[PDB]
Design a protein around this ligand. Structure first.
Ligand SMILES: Cc1cc2nc3c(=O)[nH]c(=O)nc-3n(C[C@H](O)[C@H](O)[C@H](O)COP(=O)(O)O)c2cc1C
Ligand SMILES: Cc1cc2nc3c(=O)[nH]c(=O)nc-3n(C[C@H](O)[C@H](O)[C@H](O)COP(=O)(O)O)c2cc1C
Ligand SMILES: Cc1cc2nc3c(=O)[nH]c(=O)nc-3n(C[C@H](O)[C@H](O)[C@H](O)COP(=O)(O)O)c2cc1C
Ligand SMILES: Cc1cc2nc3c(=O)[nH]c(=O)nc-3n(C[C@H](O)[C@H](O)[C@H](O)COP(=O)(O)O)c2cc1C
Lengths: 353, 353, 353, 353
């Protein structure tokens, strides 16, 4: 039985080695965060508008000014190859078939260049800064290979304390490789090419990356730039003031700070304050979750684990199936609440509980 | 032990094939809706008025201006024949013996005409519009056979995603038939009698039926007209403005949209705004649930699953028993809260929790 | 292990026949009421006052102007003889040894006269009116035998729907008798002594007893009169206006109306509005429950099941033990919150949660 | 697996005799208090500040004007020797190695003098007053041996009703001794040295110790003085008015009054009202709990059971490990919420839930 996202999670758990499933499903510390990410959606219920002609419905919507099939994206997730062979490509091709963007992780198992050469969809690149020079190299590589949008993830200044991984002594699968860091030379002896080599031999990001550094990144990247990992309207607003074209409210799927608020708690405020695109992720599993966020003003919702369950359970086809179910889910929900055009969603369709 | 509605649910589950019980009991998606429908009643508790003479109590009340034994009705439910042989007739006869109306579903297993010929009680007809022409035929048939009231159900523009049915591959019992669509001719070749035949060969309602279409229905039906499936005081008010004589607040027993609010959440507001009869259903199981709704202003409460448990467990007699228990329940509750005349109920007997 | 009331409940359940334990412990319908009666106490927590000299503490307090050892009473409960032989006397003697009043039920197994002859403590009489003439007889009997206070119970206009009793086909123990109705003659033929005989052959109270009837009772009884079963400050106030010397807020231990509010919900309001003694019962098990009610203004707390567990488990000694534990509990609590004199309790020691 | 405090609790439960584990883990009566102490932390979630340079973080902070490695302390707990041999010394040495103070209990198994001679860290002394003369002796002894701070615990005027201890008939381990009361002479015959001997032969504190007595203690002790066990901003303020240099909000880890509020409920108010150091304990297990309290204004958090689990499970090394984990936990949390300097914490990093 594969009728919803949970069904794929169940199948994924049956097919993945425990260590890998825990890497995927686990959250930080007590996992109160991942639970809160799910529970917060119950803070809203629907107030359908009846007797509305919903015979013709549209899920098409502009994201950052560019039209796509539906307000969804497959968000950046690292080590996809540990879930399914060539996982990054499977996800990218499924997203492309569905008419939505795919975001490649800095910690992907397929390189920026290789993906761009094997997929003609709308590819976005998610950046993690470990070393400024190396980051610049990846950004320029993404630019030259056709990536349309750059996403800076800011919520992993230090690694999250995921206790399942500690219990399992989780180690990156030996057959896997952080492809984007491949060929970053060596032998070079001197400050950089030493301070860099040392940085790469460390599983820690550049914790000093601040607003000033964002300005640097803004000048380097000429296209759309989003800042991911924000949990306040104030930070979202500052990002816009610093040059960002939009933001992605997110708590990294409860994988970094267990007691972090859910981004849903500051969605409406961020939308009202910034006046710019506010995308969101963390906890989305049902079409109703997605519609609630869109009704509150979100430009689009990025999927993390939802599509990864499809990938881990049935590869590319599994991802296609999850996207198909979610699209039919969103469509069904729109019809049921009396909002035929997804772009017409508003808070008026919701009741705060 | 058959002392309340739950006892009949338990017996019904023991006597019905799993597939059928799931069709009856199931809700949309995660079934958070059916649970919420039950839980919402705990938002109110009673503040009895003591030392009131309750030696003489009355449950008699006018519904749409017409007096009936108690403010209850057996609401429209499809495929009753799958629960018990000639289920529609059993329910109708039980309702008639209890002195309350029975609402026949468009998806009933006994035709509009056959029921009217075999039951002299107050029969109401619930309409689903798949094809305008066919709907008109049913409405006129109900009119000519003595049905007093017409109920338009508006919350199934598209089919609900009930996962139990998907797991069981639920298929309408072969010995059952949507009798009201019987004899709708064929062979006829041309636009209609083709666009119609195609519509009937589709398990989907007319999703375009809107306010304009309601105006059409209002002109076709000369007697009392109610719109069912509303979940907002605004929609209820618009229905009255468009000609309706009252409304039925309802989320279809949590079978259509899992995250829909419970109609109890907008009952008081709808009563205050419309100033017209506001009936309600969804989640009612105990007399206290019913009394709470009546105290908040509801004109009457329609029973869905409650009487179906009686039907599935013990046929017509089972329905008689459930109605008898509920009547004694309501009566007992009125005595206990110090409101001898059911028509005297008000919010003053309740405490918001 | 017998260190609190719950320990006695556990022992009582082990020693009583299931039917009897269910009669004792059971509540109306779903028993959400008895649960709410317990849960409501968690709506308040303590804010102790430190560095207060609590070396000398006093639990002595006036109830209706008369001093007693502590602000507790053993409330009226019927069929005590079904829990332990001569249960009414055991409870009365334990209450007397503890220095608190005992309230005899109209449905006691020991007569008004017999108890008064075998116990010299402060005896109160709880009245149920089935027949006016018979009620007058009992009231006069209580008056002539030394009962100091009369309590009219108003919350059983009709019998509660206790489903455990229905499942067990509960029948008053054959070796038991409603002693207070003994010798009410017969053979007499005519209106009364016929309308009366019929009333006694019915397990139903006089549902017509109203405010006018209370006035009649007020004129018949010359001493302190309390009205029990109130659940609103308005009713409590009316009782005072009609002549009552105080009231007992109560939902009959969740045995009559499952969805009734807990009396704790209207305690403070009743105290402020009436300006007269407001006693309370329903749900009290821990000394902290009792102290919370007293802090909110209650004159005294009546125990129902708490002391009955002591009785059912270990007879008179069991009741003595429960009262001893509760007294030590209240004393300990007073010391811990910094209120050495129980009469000094106020809302300032509480925090609303 | 020893990755957090709970892991040490699990190991401690496996290594300690049941009686001892219950003495350690148990709470008063129903233990709703210890549960509330944990649950209250979920009333706040984090709103991280992104793009803040957190490459250089500092946990150093002044407590009562004196700098220490982090805003933590190992609080006073009695009978540590029952958990691990020379438990008091193990805890003291671990605290000293971590750069934080250790508070010796009046009911310690190692004397004030012996500890001071074997540990050169910052030692605090917690006082319980059973007899004024004896208390003075201990205070002077602590003064002469180098203890920097005196803590008066005021929440054990009477002993808490811990039912686990009652069930286990808990008796202070025979190989243990209340060392601080050793050599308090005898044979002396007359008022004191009789009223004193009797006081020592009683497991009850001086319940008369009030504000006047605090003034006496204030004049006796020349250094920093804190009052522990407060649960209101009003009491905290009075302590400052009476001469205290700060307070410790605490409910004694839910071991004294089950229905006591959690000190977290009055932390912000106490900080705002007193304008003096407000330390706190009760319920702290995760670094996030600690950071929430510090963000609300707490000067420091005292650990009770957290470090005792380390002690009971693995002795001194276990305590070292727990402190190491908590420090890394706090550090990680600071980085994640964007507050590199622990002294910069404020309510702005929190969201009330
Ligand atoms: C297995 C896994 C790996 C992840 N790796 C990254 C990453 O490399 N880059 C990034 O920006 N976010 C990363 N994320 C976070 C996601 O982008 C997204 O915020 C999160 O999955 C949203 O929550 P959800 O899983 O409930 O949908 C990861 C999430 C998961 C589940
Ligand atoms: C088995 C089943 C079939 C139903 N079929 C119909 C239908 O044909 N027409 C309609 O208007 N409502 C239909 N309903 C909805 C009911 O009219 C009513 O809204 C719902 O049962 C109320 O909730 P309750 O079941 O908790 O009482 C159906 C409900 C059930 C349980
Ligand atoms: C077994 C049982 C019999 C009772 N019988 C009577 C009665 O005869 N008269 C009356 O006034 N209340 C009666 N009560 C109600 C009590 O006076 C009291 O309101 C109730 O027990 C308080 O709640 P508690 O049981 O939680 O303490 C009865 C309660 C129990 C538990
Ligand atoms: C086993 C045990 C013994 C204790 N003994 C004392 C004591 O002698 N003096 C004192 O001031 N507090 C005493 N306390 C209370 C602690 O100082 C502290 O308030 C409490 O442990 C904080 O809660 P926590 O255990 O959740 O951290 C004790 C606590 C425990 C767990």
């Amino acid at each position: 039985n594969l009728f919803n996202v949970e069904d794929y999670r169940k199948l994924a758990q049956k097919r993945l080695p425990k260590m890998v499933y825990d890497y995927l499903e686990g959250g930080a510390e007590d996992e109160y965060g991942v639970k809160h990410n799910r529970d917060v959606f119950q803070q809203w219920r629907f107030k359908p508008k009846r007797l509305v002609d919903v015979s013709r419905r549209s899920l098409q919507a502009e994201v950052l000014g560019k039209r796509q099939s539906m307000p969804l994206l497959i968000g950046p997730t690292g080590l996809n190859g540990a879930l399914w062979p060539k996982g990054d490509l499977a996800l990218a091709r499924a997203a492309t078939k569905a008419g939505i963007p795919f975001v490649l992780s800095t910690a992907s198992n397929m390189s920026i260049e290789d993906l761009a050469r094997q997929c003609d969809g709308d590819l976005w690149f998610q950046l993690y800064v470990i070393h400024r020079e190396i980051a610049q190299g990846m950004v320029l590589k993404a630019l030259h290979t056709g990536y349309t949008t750059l996403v800076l993830t800011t919520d992993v200044a230090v690694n999250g304390y995921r206790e399942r991984d500690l219990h399992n002594r989780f180690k990156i699968p030996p057959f896997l490789t952080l492809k984007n860091f491949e060929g970053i030379d060596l032998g070079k002896m001197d400050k950089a090419n030493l301070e860099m080599q040392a940085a790469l031999m460390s599983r820690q990001m550049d914790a000093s990356f601040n607003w000033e550094a964002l300005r640097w990144l803004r000048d380097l990247w000429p296209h759309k730039l989003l800042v991911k990992g924000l949990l306040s309207a104030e930070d979202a607003d500052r990002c816009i003031a610093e040059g960002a074209d939009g933001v992605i409210l997110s708590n990294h799927g409860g994988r970094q700070l267990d007691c972090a608020i859910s981004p849903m708690e500051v969605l409406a405020q961020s939308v009202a304050k910034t006046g710019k695109p506010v995308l969101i992720d963390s906890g989305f599993r049902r079409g109703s979750d997605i519609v609630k966020a869109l009704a509150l003003g979100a430009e689009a919702v990025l999927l993390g684990r939802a599509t990864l369950y499809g990938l881990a359970a049935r590869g590319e086809t599994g991802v296609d199936e999850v996207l198909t179910l979610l699209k039919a889910d969103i469509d069904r929900t729109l019809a049921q609440i009396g909002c035929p055009d997804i772009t017409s969603l508003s808070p008026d369709y919701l009741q705060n509980e």
